Write a protein that binds this ligand. Structure first.
Ligand code: SO3
Length: 525
């Protein structure tokens, strides 16, 4: 395990050499401060995502934390998983700060900062919440398209809004706003996806007057206006005429942004070059993906690939190949990734036969460690007497929703502390949604406790499937709930102060990008 400094990372970013800068702390602390291109991969779930986010075993990986002692453990596990070029960031987070490195809060910062850059450079049109409300009061001919995931749209939405995820905008707009006089308004929860969506439509050159709802659902609430909930308005299937026209416009945008082209043979060649990381991504809807997709491809709906790029393409400097079956979605998404400095190509010449693999994406995993298992009914019997400690590794949010009675929620990254707090037990039984994450924790629990440790066969899902009783709420938390950053732009229970604070934070991103100076972003037109 070597050591790499802020300067080593900065040099690689400027030269655009592949690298993976991983913050191994939990998400909440990550969200308080981290380098622009640092990807968050909590030590707690390192093994579950590393092979997908950093596929090249010899990729220069640099892990860090802020002194918790998580980094050295992460480095060792990576070595044992087969990664040959692992290092610790000199001084950790503080080392980066002390060297003069720029630090950012929140999540998916490159994507959000880029969004602000687009508006700053192209002056992307926007309408105040009050102006849009007036249009509604005037029964104006206008459609409001929500560019977020369908589940976000269902949580809360702008009155009359229609769900049209980011990458679907250029493809579906002609069917939702056929009259060129019809105004098209794009919204999200905050600003990012609304800016990208509005500019996507302008870049594609639609005849309709377009504008982003300024500050989205957050702005709607701050304006004292009313949101709807549980809505189901959504885009529909389009005609071939609509598709062909939009595809021509999209391809032009992609060519303009420098998006590369590839055919199946070209793809195979890239995957044959072991000196580069190549992510094969399907930008269509989840439903289409599961109905049939290219072998080796991962499902990353376009709008979200552009919004949460670091969750998938964690190796900055890597190569991306996008898949779609319409000629619009991949081209548009690629144009944005190109502007965010990514080397990206769109896969051409695909036929219906190429989408042969079916079902949900199966993430690549390392060898599964061995463990002695116990059936749900046996565990129930054990719990009839004291002495059995059940540890739940699922996300704290999931735990609060439903868990095995008496189970203690824990952070895999803080097991020593959790076990001390819980006292002693005659035996431990580990669980999680399916038992997958808990299985990777067996060895550590055995080491720290020196007690018999078992894995619940099938996890909590199996327990529930057995008809056994469950308990909800924060029954017993043996670790602090820092596994998830409370995004001010998700849900409707965030205080107005936090929501306005989120907008203020985005307002300062372009200035921060200037101070960082390693992004290489550019905005076409
Ligand atoms: O992309 S929006 O929800 O901030």
């Amino acid at each position: 395990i070597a050591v790499r400094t802020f300067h080593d990372i900065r040099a690689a970013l400027l030269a655009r050499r592949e690298l993976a800068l991983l913050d191994v702390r939990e998400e909440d602390p990550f969200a308080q401060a981290h380098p622009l291109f640092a990807a968050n991969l909590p030590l707690s779930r390192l093994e579950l995502e590393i092979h997908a986010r950093v596929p090249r075993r010899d990729t220069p990986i640099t892990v860090y934390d802020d002194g918790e002692g998580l980094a050295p453990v992460a480095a060792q596990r990576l070595h044992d998983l087969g990664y040959s070029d692992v290092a610790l960031l000199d001084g950790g987070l503080s080392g980066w700060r002390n060297a003069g490195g720029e630090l950012f809060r929140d999540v998916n910062v490159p994507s959000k900062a880029f969004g602000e850059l687009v508006e700053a450079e192209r002056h992307t049109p926007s309408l105040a919440a009050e102006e849009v409300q007036a249009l509604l009061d005037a029964r104006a001919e206008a459609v409001i398209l929500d560019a977020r995931r369908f589940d976000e749209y269902q949580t809360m939405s702008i009155p009359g809004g229609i769900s049209v995820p980011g990458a679907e905008l250029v493809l579906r707009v002609a069917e939702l706003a056929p009259d060129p006089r019809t105004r098209v308004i794009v919204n999200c929860a905050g600003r990012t996806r609304s800016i990208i969506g509005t500019q996507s439509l302008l870049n594609a050159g639609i005849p309709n007057p377009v504008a982003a709802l300024r500050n989205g659902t957050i702005g709607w609430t701050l304006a004292g206006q009313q949101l709807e909930h549980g809505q189901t308005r959504r885009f529909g299937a389009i005609s071939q005429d609509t598709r062909k026209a939009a595809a021509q416009r999209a391809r032009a945008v992609a060519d303009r942004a420098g998006v590369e082209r590839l055919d199946l043979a070209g793809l195979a060649q890239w995957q044959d070059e072991h000196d580069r990381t190549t992510y094969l991504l399907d930008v269509r809807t989840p439903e289409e993906y599961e109905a049939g997709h290219l072998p080796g491809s991962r499902s990353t709906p376009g709008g979200q690939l552009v919004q949460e790029t670091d969750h998938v393409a964690s190796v900055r400097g890597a190569r991306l190949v996008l898949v779609d079956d319409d000629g619009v979605r991949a081209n548009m998404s690629a144009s944005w990734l190109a502007q965010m400095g990514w080397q990206v190509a769109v896969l051409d010449g695909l036929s219906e036969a190429d989408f042969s693999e079916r079902g949900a994406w199966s993430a690549p995993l390392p060898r599964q460690p061995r463990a002695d298992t116990i059936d749900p009914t046996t565990l129930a019997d054990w719990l009839g007497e004291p002495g059995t400690r059940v540890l739940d590794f699922t996300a704290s949010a999931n735990y609060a929703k439903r868990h095995i009675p008496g189970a203690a929620w824990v952070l895999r990254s803080q097991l020593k502390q959790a076990l001390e707090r819980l006292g002693t037990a005659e035996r431990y039984v580990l669980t999680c949604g399916s038992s997958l994450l808990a299985r990777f924790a067996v060895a550590e629990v055995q080491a720290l406790s020196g007690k018999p440790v078992f894995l619940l066969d099938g996890g909590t899902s199996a327990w529930v499937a057995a008809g056994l009783p469950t308990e909800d709420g924060e029954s017993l938390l043996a670790s602090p709930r820092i596994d998830r950053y409370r995004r001010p732009y998700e849900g409707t229970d965030n205080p107005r102060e936090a929501m306005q604070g989120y907008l203020d934070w985005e307002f300062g991103l372009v200035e921060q990008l200037g101070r960082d100076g390693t992004h290489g972003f550019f905005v076409i037109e």
